[PDB]
Structure formats: C-alpha cells, structure tokens
Design a protein around this ligand. Structure first.
Ligand SMILES: Cc1ccc(NC(=O)NCCS(=O)(=O)Nc2ccc(S(N)(=O)=O)cc2)cc1
Ligand SMILES: [Zn+2]
Length: 257
C-alpha cells in the first residue's frame, strides 16, 4: 500500500495510479515571475462562520479534521470558482526539518508545512461524485513557516497525542477553521489534482500567497505522530509531502498585482 517511504512513496505511485504521470498533476512549483495577474478573478469568499467540525483522525498518512458537509455551513466561493464548494475537511503535509514539508513551492522555496482545506462542488451532490469531475474540488492551500505560534492551531496540536497512531480518532467539535487563515486572501490558482492517491485530476487549486507562522513547538508536535498503527514498529509521521510535478500545459494565475 502507498505511502511516503523509499519503497512506497511518490516515485512508486504511478504503478497503481497511472494518472500520477497525467497532464494536470499537483503540487507544482509556483514561479512568481511567470504567473500572470488576472484582473477577471474575483476576491475569494471564505464563509466559515457556521462551520461544524466533527472529528480528528490519524489516517496513517496525515491527520485530518472532518466537518459536517450535509448543508451549506462552511463554504468557499468566488475567486476562480463557479458555484458553491462545501468544506469537507482539512489536513496538513509537513517535514522532518523546517526547510521542507510543503507540497507546493514558491520559486522553488519549500515551506515547513502546508495546510489543505478541502471543499467539494455542491452541484455534484457528494464528494465521491465530485472527485470524478474536472471542477469537483477546490482545495485552499496555506503555507506554514516556523516562527511565532499560531493561536488558532493550538487546539489541534493539543489533541494530537490522543491520535498518535493509524486509525485513532477523537471528538473534535467546535473548532473554528477561520483561526488558521492568514490576513491576506491574495492567491495563485491553477487546475490540478489530489496530491495523494488516487491523484484524481479534479481540483481547482487556490494557494494563498501569505504563509501563516507556527511555533517550533507546534510543528514538533506534528512530527511526534506515527505512520504505523498501535503496537507496530514506530515510524514517525514526517515528510508526508509529494514533490512538485510538471506544470505541462497549464498557466498559474495570480489574484494580485
Ligand atoms: C498526507 C495526506 C493527506 C490527506 C490524504 N487523503 C485524504 O484526506 N482523503 C480524504 C478526503 S478526499 O477528498 O476524499 N481525498 C483527498 C486527497 C488529497 C487531497 S489534497 N492533499 O490534494 O488536498 C484532497 C482530498 C492523504 C495523505
Ligand atoms: Zn493535502
């Protein structure tokens, strides 16, 4: 089964998921000098005031917080998007060292981690159907750098020892994802894919320019999670990121001058 190790990592994925070598794979390097400002882009509309978080889960490759998406409670709209996209969950990708861990890069710069807020297009009814569509998902990607603590992340980090190993979950209600956002909503956007198997080419990527800063203590608690399940040999959950993929016939657009 797939993972991030030498023997099952991103260079192996194409054998089970041949779309790994497709025409719109993610992540990519964002070359800020080649991305074009697009004045027809709208401001993003991030409407999370009614978000209802449910559980936090170690899924063996990352940790994820799930939300109630049975209703338009936490939606992403505007920007490059048509229609309404409901928040399903967020998760992160991070490194073993502060100089790596993000999936997208900016002029080849790697950040310590990357937050993905995963949304699906309500015109498709459910996420499983959305992932079969070229405009089925919108993932809001936010870079993390190490510096000052992010207060809105602390509740997440404090529960991670209760989901150390694969398959563990915990109640994680009343969490406000607005506390994970940077000040600016300026973004880059491009058509891409899931960055993990099945690597489906169903994602409008919206990557914010402004990183959030997290403390060294916060990211160290990410690095204490385990890929393995309870009672198995401990492999620390670090470097769960896919490297940048060929841009091919795509143009990255910027919402800002
Ligand atoms: C390190 C890591 C992190 C998350 C995962 N998988 C999941 O969370 N799956 C459940 C939600 S899903 O919508 O069904 N699939 C999905 C997969 C990837 C992305 S991404 N990384 O492009 O934003 C977005 C959505 C695997 C490894
Ligand atoms: Zn992700």
């Amino acid at each position: 089964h797939w993972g991030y190790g030498k023997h099952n990592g991103p260079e192996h994925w194409h054998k089970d998921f041949p779309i790994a070598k497709g025409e719109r794979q993610s992540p990519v390097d964002i070359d800020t000098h080649t991305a074009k400002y697009d004045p027809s882009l709208k401001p993003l509309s991030v409407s999370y005031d009614q978000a209802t978080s449910l559980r936090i889960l170690n899924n063996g490759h990352s940790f994820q917080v799930t939300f109630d998406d049975s209703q338009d409670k936490a939606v992403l709209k505007g920007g490059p998007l048509d229609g309404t996209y409901r928040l399903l969950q967020f998760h992160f990708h991070w490194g073993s060292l502060d100089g790596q861990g993000s999936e997208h890069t900016v002029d080849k710069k790697k950040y310590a981690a990357e937050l993905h807020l995963v949304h699906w297009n309500t015109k498709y009814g459910d996420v499983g159907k959305a992932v079969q569509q070229p405009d089925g998902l919108a993932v809001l990607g936010i870079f993390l750098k190490v510096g000052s603590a992010k207060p809105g992340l602390q509740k997440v980090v404090d529960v991670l020892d209760s989901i150390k190993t694969e398959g563990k979950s915990a109640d994680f209600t009343n969490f406000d994802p607005r506390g994970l956002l940077p000040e600016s909503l300026d973004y880059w956007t491009y058509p891409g894919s899931l960055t993990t198997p099945p690597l489906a080419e169903c994602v409008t990527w919206i990557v914010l320019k402004e990183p959030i800063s997290v403390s060294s203590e916060q990211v160290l608690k990410f690095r204490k999670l385990n890929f393995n399940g309870e009672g198995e040999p401990e492999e620390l959950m670090v470097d769960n990121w896919r490297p940048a993929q060929p841009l091919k016939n795509r143009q990255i657009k910027a919402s800002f001058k």
